[PDB]
Amino acid sequence: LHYDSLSKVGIIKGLTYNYKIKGSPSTKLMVVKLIPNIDGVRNCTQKQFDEYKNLVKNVLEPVKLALNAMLDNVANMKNAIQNTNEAVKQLQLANKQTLAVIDTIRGEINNNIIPVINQLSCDTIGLSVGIKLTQYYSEILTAFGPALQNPVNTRITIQAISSVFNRNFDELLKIMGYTSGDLYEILHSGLIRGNIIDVDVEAGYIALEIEFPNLTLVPNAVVQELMPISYNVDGDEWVTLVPRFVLTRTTLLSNIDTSRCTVTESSVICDNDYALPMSYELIGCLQGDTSKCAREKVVSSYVPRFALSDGLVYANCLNTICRCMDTDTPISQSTTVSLLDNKKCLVYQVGDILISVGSYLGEGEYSADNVELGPPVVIDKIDIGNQLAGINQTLQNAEDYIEKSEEFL
Amino acid sequence: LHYDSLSKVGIIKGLTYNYKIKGSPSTKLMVVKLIPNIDGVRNCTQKQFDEYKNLVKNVLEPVKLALNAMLDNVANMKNAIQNTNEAVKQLQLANKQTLAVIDTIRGEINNNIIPVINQLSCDTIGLSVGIKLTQYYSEILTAFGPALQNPVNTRITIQAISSVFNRNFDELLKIMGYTSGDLYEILHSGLIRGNIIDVDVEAGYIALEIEFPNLTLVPNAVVQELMPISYNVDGDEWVTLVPRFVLTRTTLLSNIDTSRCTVTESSVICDNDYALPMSYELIGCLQGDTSKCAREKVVSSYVPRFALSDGLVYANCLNTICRCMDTDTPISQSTTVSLLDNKKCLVYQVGDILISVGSYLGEGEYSADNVELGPPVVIDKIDIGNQLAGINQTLQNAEDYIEKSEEFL
C-alpha cells in the first residue's frame, strides 16, 4: 500500500492485525467432585456433613433436570463421761453427713458437668468440618462456577485450565501448539468453552467437557484497516471509496468481509477463509495510481471529518473549524489530514463533535477493616491447699492429745 | 423521511436509535486484598487462618502462572475409757480419709475438667474467625469474581465500580461526563472492562486495572431502521429495495453499515465513524419522489410478508391470508400494511408462520425455609446448702455435750 500518496487522497492508515483460521477443537474431560470423603469419627461430623450435602443437591438438581429435558441434543465421773461419749457420737454422725455432701458434688459433676463438656467437644469438631466444607465449595465455585450456572457453552475459567493441565502452563502451550501470543488472544476473546455432558446428584459428581481450539496461522497475511475521511478539492469536499478491510500478503491483495469474524487486539480470527479476489481497477488505488477510486462528491450527506486509532485523533481542519478546549485556541492546518496530539489538551472539538482523550486516574484499594481480637476466658486453677494443711495441723493436735491421755491412764 | 408515502411503497418505519462514538478509555487501578490482618490473640486463630490462606493460594496460583506464561503480552472405768479413746482415733482417721476424697475431686477438676474447658474456649474463637474469613472471601467473590476467574477482558461488576468511586455514583457521572442515559447503555452492553496486570500470592494481592470508556455524542444524529415487506401491484407482488439502516441528521442523509457496531436499546455505539455518502437517485425514495427505488418483481423467492417492532405486528393481509388464533376469525384488509393489535389475541397467523405475542406471567419467590431454634443446654447451679446447715447443727450439739461434760467433771 502506497500510503505516501493514499493519505493525500483522503484515506488514513488504521489498525493493523494478523490473520488466523479457527480450525477444529480438541477435547478433554474432567470429573469434578463436589463432596469430599471424610473418614474417622462419624458421629461428630454427620450433622454438618448432611447440611453440606443438601447444599450440593440444591445446586445440581436443576442441572440434572435440564440435561434430561434436553437429552435428545445434550463416782459422777461415769455421768461426766456419759456426756463425753455422746459428743463423740455426734462427730461420728457429722463425718457421715459430710460424706453425703461430697457425694452430692460427685453426682453433680459426673452427671451434669462432664456429659455436657463431652457432648459440646464433639459438636466443636462438627463445626470445624462445616467450615472446611463451605470453603471447599467456594473454591469450586470460582473454577467450575460458570459450568454449574449454565450447562451449555460456558466460558471456562483459568483455574479450570490449570486443573486440566496439572498446574503446568508450559504443557498447555506445547501440547496445543500455541505461542504466548495465541494464548493471550484465546483467553481475551473467550475461545475456550465447555459443556456439562452428565451429572450424578447423590455423589455430587459432574462430567465437564472442555474444548480447546486449534488455531492455525496464515503466513505473511496481514489484515489492514483503512479509514476514509472527507477532503477539500478546489473549494468543495469529496470522499474516496474503498473496502474498509483489505488483506495484504506479499505482493497480493484481496478483500475480507469481516462481519462474521472474531477480532482481538492483534489478530482477526475467522472460520474457514473469507478472502475474496480484488479487481484491477481498485488495486491501482492502493498500488499508486491514486486515480479513479470512485471519489464521490458530497452534497446532502453527513460525512466524517475525523478518524481515531490507537488513542490518536486525525482530522480535517482545513475545510472546517477545529479547536482545543481549555486552552481556548483553534488549530490551523497548512496535506489534507492533520494530526492532533494528546499532550496539549484532553478534549478537542472538530466541527460540532467533542472528542474526549482518555486519562489516568489515581489508585484505590479494597480491603476489610483490621480487627483486633481479645483472649479467651480462662478458668483459674483451684487454689485450696493451705486450708488442707491446717486440717492436717488440727488433726495431729487431736492425735497428740489422745496419745497424751493414754500415757496418763 | 416522507413516511406518509413510503408506507404505501412498502417500507415500514422500524426502531429509532441515536448515534455515539466509542472514543478512547480512561484507566483506574485498584489493589484488592484477599487476606485481612487480624491482630491480638494469635494461638486461637492460627489454625483457621492457615486454612483460609490455603484457600487463597489455590485461587491465585493459576492466575500467577497464566500471567507469567503470557508475560510478553500481559476401777474398770479405765477399761471403759480405753474403748472411748479407740473410738476417737477412728474418727481422727475418718477425717483424714475424707480429705483424701476431697483431694481426689480437686485433682480431677483441676487436671481433667478445667484444661479442657480452657482449650475448648480458645477453639471457639478460632471457629468464629474461620466463619468471618469465609464470609469476607464471599463478598470479594461477588465483586471481583469475574477478574479472578479469567485474567483478561472481564466484565466488571457494579460492586467493583462502587469501590472505585468510593460509594458515590454522582462522582462517576460527572468525572466521566456521563448522563443517566449513558450509564445505562454502558452497563447494558458491558462496555466497562478490566484486566489483571499482576498478582502476589503470599500476600493475597491482585492488581486489577479497570477501563472506563469515554463515549462521545454526535449532535442531532439519528439512526433509523427501515423494514421492507412485499406489496400488491395490480395482481402480483413486488419488493422495494433500500439500505436497512439510514442516518438522518437534519436535512442530510447517509448510509451506515452497522455490522461492526454495538447496538443498545436506544443507541448505536460505533468505533470511529461509519457514515458514508448517499447517491441522489436513492435519496428521492425517502424525500418524496417515491419512484425508482429498484422495486423488484418477485417470482421464485421467499419474501417477508410481515415485520415486527416494539411488540407490534405489521403485515400484508391483502395479498395473502392472515388470521387470529383462539377467536377463529380472519383479519381483512381494505393501504398495503395492516397493523394487528395485541389486545384481540396473543397468537396470529400470517400465511404459514405463527407469530406469538408475549404476555405477563404471575409472580414467584425464592427463600429458605424458616427454622426455629431451641435454647442451649443450661447447667443448674449447685444445690447443696441445707445439708451443710445440718452438719453445723450436728456439730454444735457435739460442742454442747463436750462443754456439758467439762462442767460435771
Added chain:
Amino acid sequence: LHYDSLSKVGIIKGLTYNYKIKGSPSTKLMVVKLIPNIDGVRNCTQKQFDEYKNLVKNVLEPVKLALNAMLDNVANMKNAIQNTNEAVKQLQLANKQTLAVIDTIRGEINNNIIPVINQLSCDTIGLSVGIKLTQYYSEILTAFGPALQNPVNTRITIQAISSVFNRNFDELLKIMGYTSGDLYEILHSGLIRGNIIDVDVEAGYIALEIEFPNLTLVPNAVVQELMPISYNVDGDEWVTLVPRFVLTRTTLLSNIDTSRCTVTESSVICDNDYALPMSYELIGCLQGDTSKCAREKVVSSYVPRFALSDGLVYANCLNTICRCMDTDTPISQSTTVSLLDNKKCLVYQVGDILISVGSYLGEGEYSADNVELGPPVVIDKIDIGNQLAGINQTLQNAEDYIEKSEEFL
C-alpha cells in the same frame, strides 16, 4: 441446489441450519430473599446474624445506588480424761474446717466453671447459625449471582429457571411452546435475560425480572452455507462468486445477509426477517445452468484453496501441492475438490498453511484430599467410691467401740 454440478464449478456445500424469528418475550418476576427468618432463641444467634446481615448490605448497597442513579431509565482419771475431751474438740474443729474446703469447691464450680460452660454452649449455637447462613448465601450466589453482580442484561442461570417454574422443566417447555431443540438453542446462545427493577437493602430483597423469548419457526426454511474455493481452468485458476448464505424453502430461493443474526449449531435466529429476493441470472448457478456465476480470473490476489466443515478438510490438491505430516507423503488428486480424511494423520499441509485436526485427550479429575479426623477429647467419669466405702468401714468401727464402752460403763 444442484450440488452434483456446483461442486465441479468450485463451490463446496457447507453447514446446514434452520430458520427462526426471535419474536417478542414473555415476562415473569421473582422476589429473591437474601436474609432468612430465624425464630426461637435470639441471644445465641444475634452476634452471627448481625455479621451476616452486614454481608448482605455490602452486596446490595451498590445495586440500590446504581438503580437510583439510573432511575430515569431503570483420781488422775479426771486429768487423763481432760486430755480426752481436748482431743474431741480438735476433731470437732477439723470437721468444721473440712466443710470450709468443701464450700470452696462449691464456690469455684458454681461461679467459675458452670457460668463458662453455659455461656460457651450458647456461643456454639451461634456458630452453627453463622455456618448455615453462609451456606445459604452461597446457594443464592450460584443462582442469582449474575443478577447481583450487574443490574442490567444478565444471563440467567439454570437454577434461576428451575426456581421460576417450580422444579418442573416439563412446564417450561409447554408453557413457552418450546421443543427440546428450542430449549437447547436458547440456553446455548444465552437468549434468556434478566434485569433488577428494584431492591430493598434492609430486608435483603431484590426484585428480579426474567424475560423468556418466544421464538417462532418458519416452516420448511433452510439456511444453507456455500464455501467457494479456487479451481483450475486450462492451466490457470478462477473463483466462482455467490452469496455465502442462501435461503432455500421449497422451490424458492432468496438471499440472507446474516450479519446481525444469532447463529447456533443448528439454527439461525434473526429478528424480524432478513430474506431478500434473488435475481434470475444467479438462480441458474444453483438450479443447474452452471454458467455465468461471475467467475473471476485471479491474478494478483490471495485466494483460498481449502474449506472446513464439521471437522473435514476439503482442498484443491490439483493446482497446488498438499501433503500429510508425520507420514511424510503427498496427496494426489485425479473433480476439483479432494476430501482429506482424518484417519490418516492429524496435521495436513495445503500450500503454506498447516491445518490441525483436533483429537481426544485423556481424562482428569478435580477433588479435595480425603482427610481422616480423630475423636473428641473425652473426660472420664469420676472414679471415687472405694475410698468412700473405706470411710464408712472406719466410721462403724468408731461406732462399734463407742457402743462397746457404754456396755462396760
